[PDB]
Design a protein around this motif. Structure first.
Motif, PDB file in Angstrom:
ATOM      1  N   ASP A 254       0.813  -1.211   0.000  1.00 51.66           N
ATOM      2  CA  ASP A 254       0.000   0.000   0.000  1.00 51.66           C
ATOM      3  C   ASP A 254       0.853   1.270   0.000  1.00 51.66           C
ATOM      4  O   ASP A 254       0.325   2.383   0.003  1.00 51.66           O
ATOM      5  N   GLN A 255       2.171   1.100  -0.007  1.00 53.33           N
ATOM      6  CA  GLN A 255       3.083   2.236  -0.016  1.00 53.33           C
ATOM      7  C   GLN A 255       3.964   2.215  -1.261  1.00 53.33           C
ATOM      8  O   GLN A 255       5.056   2.783  -1.278  1.00 53.33           O
ATOM      9  N   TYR A 256       3.460   1.575  -2.310  1.00 52.27           N
ATOM     10  CA  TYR A 256       4.197   1.427  -3.560  1.00 52.27           C
ATOM     11  C   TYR A 256       4.588   2.754  -4.215  1.00 52.27           C
ATOM     12  O   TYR A 256       5.691   2.882  -4.747  1.00 52.27           O
ATOM     13  N   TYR A 257       3.683   3.729  -4.202  1.00 59.49           N
ATOM     14  CA  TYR A 257       3.926   4.981  -4.920  1.00 59.49           C
ATOM     15  C   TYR A 257       5.036   5.798  -4.267  1.00 59.49           C
ATOM     16  O   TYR A 257       5.895   6.347  -4.958  1.00 59.49           O
ATOM     17  N   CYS A 258       5.027   5.882  -2.943  1.00 53.69           N
ATOM     18  CA  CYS A 258       6.140   6.528  -2.253  1.00 53.69           C
ATOM     19  C   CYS A 258       7.411   5.726  -2.488  1.00 53.69           C
ATOM     20  O   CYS A 258       8.489   6.287  -2.688  1.00 53.69           O
ATOM     21  N   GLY A 259       7.274   4.408  -2.473  1.00 51.28           N
ATOM     22  CA  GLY A 259       8.406   3.533  -2.700  1.00 51.28           C
ATOM     23  C   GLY A 259       9.008   3.706  -4.080  1.00 51.28           C
ATOM     24  O   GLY A 259      10.226   3.798  -4.220  1.00 51.28           O
ATOM     25  N   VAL A 260       8.164   3.761  -5.106  1.00 51.02           N
ATOM     26  CA  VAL A 260       8.684   3.817  -6.465  1.00 51.02           C
ATOM     27  C   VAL A 260       9.218   5.212  -6.771  1.00 51.02           C
ATOM     28  O   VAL A 260      10.153   5.359  -7.553  1.00 51.02           O
ATOM     29  N   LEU A 261       8.644   6.232  -6.139  1.00 55.51           N
ATOM     30  CA  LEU A 261       9.162   7.588  -6.274  1.00 55.51           C
ATOM     31  C   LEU A 261      10.585   7.646  -5.745  1.00 55.51           C
ATOM     32  O   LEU A 261      11.490   8.154  -6.405  1.00 55.51           O
ATOM     33  N   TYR A 262      10.777   7.109  -4.547  1.00 54.25           N
ATOM     34  CA  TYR A 262      12.091   7.089  -3.923  1.00 54.25           C
ATOM     35  C   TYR A 262      13.129   6.310  -4.745  1.00 54.25           C
ATOM     36  O   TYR A 262      14.215   6.814  -4.999  1.00 54.25           O
ATOM     37  N   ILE A 289       4.229  10.233   2.841  1.00 56.98           N
ATOM     38  CA  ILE A 289       4.403  11.670   2.971  1.00 56.98           C
ATOM     39  C   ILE A 289       3.532  12.129   4.134  1.00 56.98           C
ATOM     40  O   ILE A 289       2.339  11.833   4.191  1.00 56.98           O
ATOM     41  N   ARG A 290       4.149  12.821   5.083  1.00 57.32           N
ATOM     42  CA  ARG A 290       3.453  13.250   6.290  1.00 57.32           C
ATOM     43  C   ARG A 290       3.570  14.748   6.480  1.00 57.32           C
ATOM     44  O   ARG A 290       4.602  15.337   6.167  1.00 57.32           O
ATOM     45  N   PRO A 291       2.511  15.374   7.007  1.00 59.90           N
ATOM     46  CA  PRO A 291       2.619  16.792   7.343  1.00 59.90           C
ATOM     47  C   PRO A 291       3.493  16.982   8.576  1.00 59.90           C
ATOM     48  O   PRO A 291       3.614  16.069   9.392  1.00 59.90           O
ATOM     49  N   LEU A 292       4.108  18.150   8.695  1.00 58.37           N
ATOM     50  CA  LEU A 292       4.812  18.512   9.916  1.00 58.37           C
ATOM     51  C   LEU A 292       3.886  19.349  10.794  1.00 58.37           C
ATOM     52  O   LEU A 292       3.494  20.450  10.412  1.00 58.37           O
ATOM     53  N   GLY A 293       3.532  18.822  11.962  1.00 51.85           N
ATOM     54  CA  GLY A 293       2.593  19.488  12.848  1.00 51.85           C
ATOM     55  C   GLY A 293       3.103  20.799  13.425  1.00 51.85           C
ATOM     56  O   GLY A 293       4.215  21.230  13.116  1.00 51.85           O
ATOM     57  N   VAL A 294       2.276  21.432  14.259  1.00 49.17           N
ATOM     58  CA  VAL A 294       2.647  22.665  14.958  1.00 49.17           C
ATOM     59  C   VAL A 294       3.962  22.448  15.694  1.00 49.17           C
ATOM     60  O   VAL A 294       4.849  23.300  15.706  1.00 49.17           O
ATOM     61  N   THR A 295       4.060  21.281  16.314  1.00 45.95           N
ATOM     62  CA  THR A 295       5.310  20.759  16.852  1.00 45.95           C
ATOM     63  C   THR A 295       6.542  21.052  15.974  1.00 45.95           C
ATOM     64  O   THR A 295       7.443  21.806  16.361  1.00 45.95           O
ATOM     65  N   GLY A 296       6.539  20.480  14.771  1.00 47.73           N
ATOM     66  CA  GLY A 296       7.768  20.296  14.022  1.00 47.73           C
ATOM     67  C   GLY A 296       7.976  18.802  13.842  1.00 47.73           C
ATOM     68  O   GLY A 296       8.932  18.361  13.203  1.00 47.73           O
ATOM     69  N   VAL A 297       7.057  18.021  14.411  1.00 51.86           N
ATOM     70  CA  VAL A 297       7.106  16.564  14.326  1.00 51.86           C
ATOM     71  C   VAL A 297       6.038  16.018  13.372  1.00 51.86           C
ATOM     72  O   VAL A 297       4.885  16.467  13.381  1.00 51.86           O
ATOM     73  N   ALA A 298       6.441  15.044  12.558  1.00 53.69           N
ATOM     74  CA  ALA A 298       5.591  14.451  11.527  1.00 53.69           C
ATOM     75  C   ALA A 298       4.273  13.896  12.063  1.00 53.69           C
ATOM     76  O   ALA A 298       4.237  13.230  13.099  1.00 53.69           O
ATOM     77  N   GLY A 299       3.194  14.168  11.335  1.00 52.54           N
ATOM     78  CA  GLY A 299       1.876  13.683  11.698  1.00 52.54           C
ATOM     79  C   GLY A 299       1.547  12.363  11.028  1.00 52.54           C
ATOM     80  O   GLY A 299       2.436  11.549  10.775  1.00 52.54           O
ATOM     81  N   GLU A 300       0.267  12.153  10.737  1.00 56.03           N
ATOM     82  CA  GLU A 300      -0.187  10.906  10.132  1.00 56.03           C
ATOM     83  C   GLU A 300       0.028  10.900   8.623  1.00 56.03           C
ATOM     84  O   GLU A 300      -0.094  11.934   7.973  1.00 56.03           O
ATOM     85  N   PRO A 301       0.354   9.722   8.066  1.00 59.99           N
ATOM     86  CA  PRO A 301       0.549   9.547   6.622  1.00 59.99           C
ATOM     87  C   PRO A 301      -0.658  10.002   5.804  1.00 59.99           C
ATOM     88  O   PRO A 301      -1.792   9.652   6.125  1.00 59.99           O
ATOM     89  N   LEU A 302      -0.400  10.781   4.759  1.00 59.13           N
ATOM     90  CA  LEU A 302      -1.458  11.325   3.915  1.00 59.13           C
ATOM     91  C   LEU A 302      -1.851  10.334   2.819  1.00 59.13           C
ATOM     92  O   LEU A 302      -1.045   9.480   2.445  1.00 59.13           O
ATOM     93  N   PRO A 303      -3.093  10.435   2.301  1.00 58.04           N
ATOM     94  CA  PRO A 303      -3.522   9.520   1.238  1.00 58.04           C
ATOM     95  C   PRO A 303      -2.712   9.711  -0.035  1.00 58.04           C
ATOM     96  O   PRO A 303      -2.552  10.841  -0.486  1.00 58.04           O
ATOM     97  N   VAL A 304      -2.209   8.619  -0.598  1.00 54.34           N
ATOM     98  CA  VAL A 304      -1.417   8.680  -1.822  1.00 54.34           C
ATOM     99  C   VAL A 304      -1.894   7.607  -2.793  1.00 54.34           C
ATOM    100  O   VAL A 304      -1.896   6.425  -2.463  1.00 54.34           O
ATOM    101  N   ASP A 305      -2.313   8.017  -3.985  1.00 50.11           N
ATOM    102  CA  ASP A 305      -2.860   7.062  -4.944  1.00 50.11           C
ATOM    103  C   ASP A 305      -2.117   7.060  -6.267  1.00 50.11           C
ATOM    104  O   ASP A 305      -2.496   6.356  -7.202  1.00 50.11           O
ATOM    105  N   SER A 306      -1.053   7.847  -6.333  1.00 46.52           N
ATOM    106  CA  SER A 306      -0.204   7.908  -7.510  1.00 46.52           C
ATOM    107  C   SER A 306       1.040   8.684  -7.142  1.00 46.52           C
ATOM    108  O   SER A 306       1.074   9.343  -6.104  1.00 46.52           O
ATOM    109  N   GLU A 307       2.062   8.603  -7.984  1.00 47.76           N
ATOM    110  CA  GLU A 307       3.262   9.394  -7.768  1.00 47.76           C
ATOM    111  C   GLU A 307       2.908  10.870  -7.798  1.00 47.76           C
ATOM    112  O   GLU A 307       3.450  11.667  -7.029  1.00 47.76           O
TER     113      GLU A 307
END
Ligand SMILES: Cc1cn([C@H]2C[C@H](O)[C@@H](COP(=O)(O)NP(=O)(O)OP(=O)(O)O)O2)c(=O)[nH]c1=O
Ligand SMILES: [Mg+2]
Ligand SMILES: [Mg+2]
Ligand code: NA
Ligand code: NA
Length: 326
Positions: A254-262, A289-307
């Motif tokens: 389920d993480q193929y697109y991030c994988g193939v991009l890398y 790919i995750r957003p960086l919260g108010v913290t500066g620390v990565a949040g939850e993985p965002l939906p990715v359906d293509s490169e």
DNA sequence: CCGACATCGCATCAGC
DNA sequence: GCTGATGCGA
DNA sequence: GTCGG
């Protein structure tokens, strides 16, 4: 390439800072500069002209002025004549021998190819294989051979389990007419970000490739990454093909697109894209790919359906693999 | 100016 | 053996 | 080595 002289100079400086100075950020700086110049569609006339490009500052502008005037760089001329630098720069060309190990070997009086071949008992396994195929590993792989290799890898993988998907990435997927090695992205439906429902998924593939004598040596091998050596079969009376570096990376289905991009790269492209991500408030790795919260620390993985979805998040126009050769 | 600079798997080692 | 750091290459 | 804050 209109500026081959300049980019070669910057690459040799980059390699110096990496291998000798052990300054990875200077290495990255020179390589970013070499990259931005390589794609610049004019024959550079001066350091000032080059300095307009992002990544080219004052020091490199001055070096370009010296090089354009004389055809050489005195800094490099001196580096080339330094014994310790020359020794280290040679030793690090062996896979497994890094900047630190190279210095340690020189300290122990081990500093030539012949020295290495008589001190094999002082090398770890990776280094030992890197030495064995020192010659082969500096040969490029014609795309024609990459196609034969792809053909073997995909078909052997199918024989293990038809539900595997193997994708050749790296410079090959970017359409390069030659490659330095083979990079393989592997998925199987049993292995996702939610669970691993079967063990030995990578192992069974490696085993099959060893069985048909495609994979010949192993540099490193874990649950998700294999780094090794392979060789095309040759015919009767034919000289054998050179041994080749192969990497195989098992990534959650389920993480193929991030994988193939890398794994498609290039490495400089990944660095620049990930840097841009951070500016836009995201962080990208090979999984998510995750957003960086108010913290500066990565949040939850965002939906990715293509490169392209990944490009969209960081507000970049989509670029085909062939246009990622930075 | 001014240091932050993309991100990580595997092998290896020190310390407990 | 476990944990965390380092080296290395990706 | 470079460059944004
Ligand atoms: C070296 C390196 C590679 N990568 C990713 C992008 C590369 O395209 C991909 C494969 O690494 P490679 O085989 O070292 N480079 P390549 O396949 O693009 O080019 P080559 O023909 O093998 O030299 O791994 C990084 O993300 N950071 C890196 O530092
Ligand atoms: Mg490659
Ligand atoms: Mg590779
Ligand atoms: Na610049
Ligand atoms: Na090396």
């Amino acid at each position: 390439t209109l500026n081959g002289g300049i980019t070669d100079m910057l690459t040799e400086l980059a390699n110096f800072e990496k291998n000798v100075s052990q300054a990875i950020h200077k290495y990255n700086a020179y390589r970013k500069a070499a990259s931005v110049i390589a794609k610049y569609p004019h024959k550079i006339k001066s350091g000032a002209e080059a300095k307009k490009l992002p990544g080219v500052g004052t020091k490199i502008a001055e070096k370009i002025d010296e090089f354009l005037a004389t055809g050489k760089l005195r800094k490099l001329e001196k580096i080339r004549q330094d014994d310790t630098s020359s020794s280290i720069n040679f030793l690090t060309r062996v896979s497994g021998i890094g900047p630190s190990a190279a210095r340690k070997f020189v300290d122990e009086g081990i500093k030539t190819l012949e020295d290495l071949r008589k001190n094999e008992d002082k090398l770890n396994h990776h280094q030992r294989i890197g030495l064995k195929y020192f010659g082969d590993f500096e040969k490029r792989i014609p795309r024609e051979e990459m196609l034969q290799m792809q053909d073997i890898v995909l078909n052997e993988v199918k024989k293990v389990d038809s539900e595997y998907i193997a994708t050749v990435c790296g410079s090959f997927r970017r359409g390069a007419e030659s490659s330095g090695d083979m990079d393989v992205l592997l998925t199987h439906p049993s292995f996702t970000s939610e669970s691993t429902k079967q063990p030995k998924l990578l192992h069974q593939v490696v085993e099959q490739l060893q069985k048909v004598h495609f994979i010949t040596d192993t540099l490193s091998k874990g649950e998700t990454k294999f780094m090794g050596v392979c060789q095309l079969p040759s015919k009767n009376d034919e000289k054998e093909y050179p041994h080749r570096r192969i990497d195989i990376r098992l990534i959650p289905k389920d993480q193929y697109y991030c994988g193939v991009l890398y794994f498609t790269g290039s490495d400089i492209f990944n660095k620049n894209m990930r840097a841009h991500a951070l500016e836009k408030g995201f962080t990208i790795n090979e999984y998510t790919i995750r957003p960086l919260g108010v913290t500066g620390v990565a949040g939850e993985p965002l939906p990715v359906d293509s490169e392209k979805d990944i490009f969209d998040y960081i507000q970049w126009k989509y670029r085909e693999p062939k246009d990622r050769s930075e």
